[PDB]
Amino acid sequence: IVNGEEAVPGSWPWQVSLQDKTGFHFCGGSLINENWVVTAAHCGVTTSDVVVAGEFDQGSSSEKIQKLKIAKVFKNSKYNSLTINNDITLLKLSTAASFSQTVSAVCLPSASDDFAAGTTCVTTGWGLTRY
Amino acid sequence: TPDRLQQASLPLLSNTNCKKYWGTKIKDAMICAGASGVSSCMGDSGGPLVCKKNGAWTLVGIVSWGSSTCSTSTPGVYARVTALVNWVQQTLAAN
């Protein structure tokens, strides 16, 4: 996020951080419930990566975060690698997230749901803050 | 990357005014937002684009792509959860 501000700790309980055996954060994900995360297709998540929730400060050891394993990667089949059209991957967790004051589900909309232009939204993550 | 989680508010746009920018790259299952002075960026992907709808944050989009440079002028481009919730609804029934 270039030009964003630090969040309030645990105020976005659905945010996951996907990290490789290395501990490297490379993509964000979202909790739709306690057995399944949603991130992007391009991310390219494998079952050797770990889903991390409850995190706030990637660099803190004293933070009671949850490191979740991936059972199955479910890439949409309408996913268009050359286009980046339909860039949704589901992740099925081998071990259930424990819901708490800092781990919760986001709401999914209706196919029907309308979300109109000039509407003020909010995006989060642990992305380059500078280019 | 930053160590601790960041957040930015940004206005969603129509795809049309977005085409003004991204052209025929903008597809129907894709939804633009920003060009507000904030920019999603490397490492942001997979992540949440939420909106407030009748008390709750709803998953409205998924950071997917945009500027090579993360320009606060170019709108970012996210997944359009509305065009895909049908499939999500469905993987879960199944597994």
Partner: peptide
């Protein structure tokens, strides 16, 4: 869903 325990601040 979508209603956190810790309310986000902007």
């Amino acid at each position: 869903c979508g209603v956190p325990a810790i309310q986000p601040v902007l």
